[PDB]
Amino acid sequence: PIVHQAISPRTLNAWVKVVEEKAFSPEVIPMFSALSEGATPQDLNTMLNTVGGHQAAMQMLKETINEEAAEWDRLHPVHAGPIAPGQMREPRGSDIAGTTSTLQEQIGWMTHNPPIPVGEIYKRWIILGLNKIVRMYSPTSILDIRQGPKEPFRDYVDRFYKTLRAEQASQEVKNWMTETLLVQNANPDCKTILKALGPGATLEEMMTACQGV
Amino acid sequence: PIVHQAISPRTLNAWVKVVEEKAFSPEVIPMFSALSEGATPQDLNTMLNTVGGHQAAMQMLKETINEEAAEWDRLHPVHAGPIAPGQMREPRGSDIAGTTSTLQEQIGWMTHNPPIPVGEIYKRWIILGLNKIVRMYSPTSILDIRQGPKEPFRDYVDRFYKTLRAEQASQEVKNWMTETLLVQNANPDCKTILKALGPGATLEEMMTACQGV
Amino acid sequence: PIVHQAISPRTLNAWVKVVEEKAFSPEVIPMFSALSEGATPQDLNTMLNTVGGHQAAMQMLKETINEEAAEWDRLHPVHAGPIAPGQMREPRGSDIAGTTSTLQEQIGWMTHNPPIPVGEIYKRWIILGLNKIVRMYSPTSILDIRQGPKEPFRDYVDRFYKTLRAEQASQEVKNWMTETLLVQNANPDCKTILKALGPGATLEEMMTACQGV
Amino acid sequence: PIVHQAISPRTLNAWVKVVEEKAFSPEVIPMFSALSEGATPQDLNTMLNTVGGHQAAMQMLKETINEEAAEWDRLHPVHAGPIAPGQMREPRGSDIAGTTSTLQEQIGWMTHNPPIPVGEIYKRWIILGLNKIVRMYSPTSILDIRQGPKEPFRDYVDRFYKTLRAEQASQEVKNWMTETLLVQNANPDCKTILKALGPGATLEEMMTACQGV
Amino acid sequence: PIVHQAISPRTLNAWVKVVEEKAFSPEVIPMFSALSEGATPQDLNTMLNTVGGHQAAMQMLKETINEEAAEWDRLHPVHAGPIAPGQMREPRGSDIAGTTSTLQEQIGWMTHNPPIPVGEIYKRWIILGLNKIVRMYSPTSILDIRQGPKEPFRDYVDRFYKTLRAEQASQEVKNWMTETLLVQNANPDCKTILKALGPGATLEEMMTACQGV
Amino acid sequence: PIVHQAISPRTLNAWVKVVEEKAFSPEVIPMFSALSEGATPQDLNTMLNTVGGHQAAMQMLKETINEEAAEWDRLHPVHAGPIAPGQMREPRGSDIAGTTSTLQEQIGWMTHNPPIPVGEIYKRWIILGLNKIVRMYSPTSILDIRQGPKEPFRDYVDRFYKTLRAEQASQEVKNWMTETLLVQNANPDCKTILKALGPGATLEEMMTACQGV
Ligand SMILES: Cc1[nH]c2ccccc2c1CC(=O)N[C@@H](Cc1ccccc1)C(=O)N(C)c1ccccc1
Ligand SMILES: Cc1[nH]c2ccccc2c1CC(=O)N[C@@H](Cc1ccccc1)C(=O)N(C)c1ccccc1
Ligand SMILES: Cc1[nH]c2ccccc2c1CC(=O)N[C@@H](Cc1ccccc1)C(=O)N(C)c1ccccc1
Ligand SMILES: Cc1[nH]c2ccccc2c1CC(=O)N[C@@H](Cc1ccccc1)C(=O)N(C)c1ccccc1
Ligand SMILES: Cc1[nH]c2ccccc2c1CC(=O)N[C@@H](Cc1ccccc1)C(=O)N(C)c1ccccc1
Ligand SMILES: Cc1[nH]c2ccccc2c1CC(=O)N[C@@H](Cc1ccccc1)C(=O)N(C)c1ccccc1
Ligand SMILES: [Cl-]
Ligand SMILES: [Cl-]
Ligand SMILES: [Cl-]
Ligand SMILES: [Cl-]
Ligand SMILES: [Cl-]
Ligand SMILES: [Cl-]
Ligand SMILES: [Cl-]
Ligand SMILES: [Cl-]
Ligand SMILES: [Cl-]
Ligand SMILES: [Cl-]
Ligand SMILES: [Cl-]
Ligand SMILES: [Cl-]
């Protein structure tokens, strides 16, 4: 990461083990982001290359990065000119993704006034592609989450918000799913109980209300 | 945490493993607090996102945070004005919870004269919500803790104060439960023995007194 | 601990694992003390809260701390007055135990000329309470330790000094137990052998003497 | 690595364990490169010597290094002359590979104005030889990767790009394999589906399209 | 250890695990010494207290320390006088063993011109007592080590020098045991072979000579 | 190692575990050398003492060191004279091996203008003795390595160069063994194939040539 310092063996080992155990579960992404705080594109690519298997996902992730790189290039067209002494060039999508830049060039951009934070830019595009993959490898839809007739409310809520966490939707949409589906898809016994509090009640209140039942 | 330094792989790994093994047992909270000393809201959210499962709890925790955020906003209304050079804006609940602020904005508030410690503020609200969840996921009530007819006193006391640690109550109330229930719910044999010391006796004295019996 | 630095994940993890494996065996206490070198009351309380189970002991430990706190208060009565700029208040038992002081207040006392070392003071009271608990949870008495008729001397000596380490007694008393009981409670065969050296002989000499027998 | 600092026990241990578990799988190479950031030729050779077994590969790796060393020597012929005070000699292939230079000589070249980065040069030649070995120890060819009649598309894509990652080919060639083979070798059912999007469709679109089938 | 720095959790954990696995095997002592480089008497005592079991040995170790303490006191008698400002007292055996001195007093002696290295002095006395215990808990004598009629020479030599390492003897004596016993106690077949080289032959030569046989 | 800094618990633990698992396999030596970068003779001896078992080897290693020490003494005879203030004595073989010098004396020699690097000198003599032992404990000879009639070429090459790595021979000799034996000892089927490339062919070419067969 940036200081340039080498990425620690236990950081790398942690990243590897995460993916083995959990595959593309939503929580892998914060872990990824945690493990890569202050990382350079080289460090980010290293991290992605140390994954074996899951190559279809890694390929999708590539394309997503290429798309983001091409978008960057459009907004930031590179001018012809000799980079003057005591000064650094403008980066291109490929430099951000680490394919056409060096470690020093990456070091150069990130430590400067102003900083051109290619680490945090590329990191944006990578997390972007990880969400698509999580979203894609999630098997079920939030509309299919229903409470079984004997299922403790708490377990339904765990399944509801787990499936929700992986959904393709903005916040306004997710608020709406919470507001509509949660109560809608409860089993009749508890569905009754909850309606009897109305739509101003907290999840604490709802969980404690259908607790016994 | 704050120095900004990345949160260590073993910190993160420790937090993950805690929750797998112990779920929402009261001792997870000091561990949480320990693992997050000097943490920024970004670091705190990272920690909370690396939990898979337990999403109903995480949702309740969200609401609790929103409530605390809205309370903060009431007491601290944000004024319109250009933030002047060499100066930093007033935070809003959403900035404290990390949703509408950057890492630098968080760094900005925490390192300053005076410090505006959004790390320790948000941490307050998170622990708050963890207590509610611990409290909620605790199965039994302190009123149900009774000594079995053959149960070594020491084992009853362990169950008493374990259930007590998870109770919804203030200190005055807990003193009262200790003072009333402990001796009240002992089995007849030992209940006799203890009454014969009176209400000035130490737990050491009480445990050593019903030791053989 | 003090530098304020956060307490390390492996310190915390070490403390947790100690108590799981060994419970309240005498050696847990040096470990505790080792793991808490330079710790603040907050750090000490953290460490104590990360223990689940064993709550009867933790309760006794509380009372012991309250007793020590009340004793401190007697010897150190707090005066009314405005704490003047460039100066720090006098601590009360509750501040030492971490319940009515902040991290900075604790930092304040410990780093100063002179230092008011609330870390090492509270640590005193905690170890105090741990000894009582070790002492209490020790099953046997040193008077009950006798050498079996076929028991290798070395194994008797291991049981003797293990039970001894956990006894409620001062040094003068322990010298006396060593001097009297060790030789007194040996089996007849070896009891003879040892008497034949007298009371000036080293444990090395005694162990090597009853070695074959 | 360079600061000279000793290479960490966990770095070394990590490198050893990598090769035991994964042999010469493509992902071992980024791991190698990660574990050796800032390494000297001595450190690089150490790392290679701590591998037991796999000696045929290590021998091929040697030859590759000798070839690269001899190529370096051709482009950089060494001049006769006394190395003047406050100055450092020109390196030869053998000095780069660590066989005819010292630690200080390596330290000398790497820290200087300009730097002569024998660490990153030799590292180039080593990774070069690792690719040949990965390439060689890869059992299958990309032309043999076909989708089974019941095989979920996602699993075919994983096998396609895994075999692809290990192929001997430049980027232009790999683009061509992706463009031609992937769709060509799909099973008839899904082959139809995909043709019906054409050759402008993303892997996301293709995977989600043959998802159900 | 000394800088005062707290002793690391993994140092402590390492020391504990050593004794569990290996008991009092000669190699535990270098490990002890390794783990305690730069340690204060407090740190040394901590290390010794974290051992459970083996208390007979710990008791012998105590006595040995008391003997060394009393010897120190004889050679270094303490003078009456007020320790003057900017100056430090003379230590007594009990101060060296950590029983009548503080951490600062220990810090005081060790960092000074001249240094009074109570860490390395007490460490001397501890290793002293560990040797006696190793020596004592070693079951066999070097005179009993004989080569079996089918026993590979190499295995006899391993048993010879293992038993030798644990013997009570000075270097002159050990040279003599090597010189006399090794060849003396070999089985007739190989005993012949070796005599036929004479007493100027290396262990390499001797091992390679009785290799096949 | 040198800064004097204590040798890390994980360094020591790593060294111990290496020898347990791998005994005296050639790769243990680079590991040894890696783990001991910048080590003092005291640190080197510590490392060697933490090995239990394998004492015949450790004894041979001693003799080898004594031989190297006596050779040093011959080339470097010690002069009589008072070591003058601001100056350090000339070392003797025994000082290099750590038996007649202190930690400071070792520190003294290694940090100086010029440096007298007793760490790297003694390390030379130790690795020297480790090679002899590896060489000796290697069971087979390179002349005995033949390809089985069904044995994949790659597996023969692994056995060839593994046995080769442990051989007593200089580089000129090893080049010759490679050049002569490898092709000579192949099975008839593949022996034919290879002869048909001649003696200018790379191991890559040879391995890929007998690949199918
Ligand atoms: C874990 C989770 N489940 C979801 C379901 C639907 C939509 C999103 C999610 C998330 C991610 C998720 O929302 N994580 C939270 C952090 C968090 C996690 C767990 C408890 C409390 C706070 C987050 O990243 N931020 C920025 C946040 C912070 C406070 C309030 C709201 C959001
Ligand atoms: C562990 C526990 N059990 C309880 C039951 C009822 C109410 C609270 C609890 C607690 C938490 C609990 O009280 N923890 C203690 C620390 C502690 C833990 C264990 C032993 C001694 C000190 C604490 O956080 N503080 C601030 C404290 C310190 C000294 C005295 C009183 C309180
Ligand atoms: C381990 C142990 N067993 C006992 C039995 C009765 C009374 C006390 C104990 C102890 C604790 C015990 O005495 N530990 C020793 C350290 C120690 C441990 C083991 C061997 C040598 C030195 C200690 O803390 N100190 C201050 C000490 C140091 C030197 C001499 C005497 C005491
Ligand atoms: C993992 C992999 N599979 C391949 C198949 C064919 C050819 C090459 C490969 C690779 C290595 C591979 O291409 N790794 C990527 C890093 C990477 C890995 C995984 C996902 C996203 C980015 C890489 O090293 N660089 C420089 C890169 C970065 C962005 C876009 C394109 C290339
Ligand atoms: C391991 C061992 N076995 C013995 C048998 C009899 C007497 C002593 C021992 C020892 C301890 C032993 O002698 N250890 C050696 C270190 C060592 C260990 C192993 C191989 C080479 C060097 C040691 O501490 N020193 C000071 C030493 C160094 C060089 C030559 C001679 C002695
Ligand atoms: C591993 C090994 N097998 C051998 C067989 C015969 C003779 C020696 C050996 C060795 C040790 C061996 O030669 N190790 C190599 C490092 C190395 C290891 C593995 C692959 C590439 C480079 C080494 O130490 N050096 C100095 C070296 C570096 C480049 C070229 C030639 C030698
Ligand atoms: Cl790669
Ligand atoms: Cl690409
Ligand atoms: Cl998230
Ligand atoms: Cl929300
Ligand atoms: Cl708590
Ligand atoms: Cl209380
Ligand atoms: Cl080697
Ligand atoms: Cl070579
Ligand atoms: Cl103790
Ligand atoms: Cl004593
Ligand atoms: Cl030793
Ligand atoms: Cl010797």
Side-chain angles (χ1 to χ4, degrees), chain D residues 2 6 18 25 51 63-64 68 77 104 107 131 136 138 143 180 186:
Chain D
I2 212 65
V18 164
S25 202
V51 183
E63 299 186 355
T64 288
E68 299 303 305
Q104 298 296 324
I107 287 168
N131 290 300
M136 180 146 293
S138 178
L143 313 166
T180 303

Side-chain angles (χ1 to χ4, degrees), chain B residues 72-128:
Chain B
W72 173 270
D73 288 343
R74 188 179 69 77
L75 305 180
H76 304 80
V78 75
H79 291 79
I83 302 305
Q87 200 75 67
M88 184 90 280
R89 71 203 189 89
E90 328 94 315
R92 291 178 303 105
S94 55
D95 303 319
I96 292 157
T99 78
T100 59
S101 65
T102 62
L103 196 55
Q104 298 296 324
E105 288 180 323
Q106 286 155 35
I107 287 168
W109 289 307
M110 297 167 69
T111 58
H112 184 252
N113 180 294
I116 295 171
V118 300
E120 298 294 312
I121 298 164
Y122 183 31
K123 186 161 181 185
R124 262 193 258 301
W125 310 345
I126 290 174
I127 287 165
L128 205 69

Side-chain angles (χ1 to χ4, degrees), chain B residues 204, chain C residues 15 18-19 23-34 36 44 47-48 51 54 56-65 68 122-138 165-166:
Chain B
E204 194 177 41
Chain C
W15 177 232
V18 164
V19 171
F24 303 108
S25 202
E27 74 267 28
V28 176
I29 295 169
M31 197 53 79
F32 178 77
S33 187
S36 45
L44 304 172
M47 286 185 61
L48 296 170
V51 183
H54 308 308
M58 303 300 106
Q59 184 64 44
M60 291 174 50
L61 183 63
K62 267 182 177 126
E63 299 186 355
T64 288
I65 290 164
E68 299 303 305
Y122 183 31
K123 186 161 181 185
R124 262 193 258 301
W125 310 345
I126 290 174
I127 287 165
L128 205 69
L130 289 165
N131 290 300
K132 301 189 184 181
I133 295 162
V134 156
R135 257 182 259 128
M136 180 146 293
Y137 283 44
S138 178
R165 190 189 187 176

Side-chain angles (χ1 to χ4, degrees), chain B residues 10 30 37 158 161 165 203, chain C residues 4 10 49 51 56 59 63:
Chain B
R10 93 183 313 161
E37 288 189 58
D158 284 328
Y161 281 89
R165 190 189 187 176
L203 181 63
Chain C
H4 177 269
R10 93 183 313 161
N49 291 310
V51 183
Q59 184 64 44
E63 299 186 355

Side-chain angles (χ1 to χ4, degrees), chain A residues 161 164-165 174, chain B residues 45 48-49 55 58 61-62 97 99 122:
Chain A
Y161 281 89
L164 195 59
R165 190 189 187 176
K174 293 202 173 192
Chain B
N45 284 331
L48 296 170
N49 291 310
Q55 281 301 308
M58 303 300 106
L61 183 63
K62 267 182 177 126
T99 78
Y122 183 31

Side-chain angles (χ1 to χ4, degrees), chain A residues 178-198:
Chain A
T178 285
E179 283 175 338
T180 303
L181 294 175
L182 177 63
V183 190
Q184 196 210 49
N185 282 337
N187 61 44
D189 290 340
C190 164
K191 191 188 171 83
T192 297
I193 303 301
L194 295 172
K195 292 276 189 165
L197 297 179

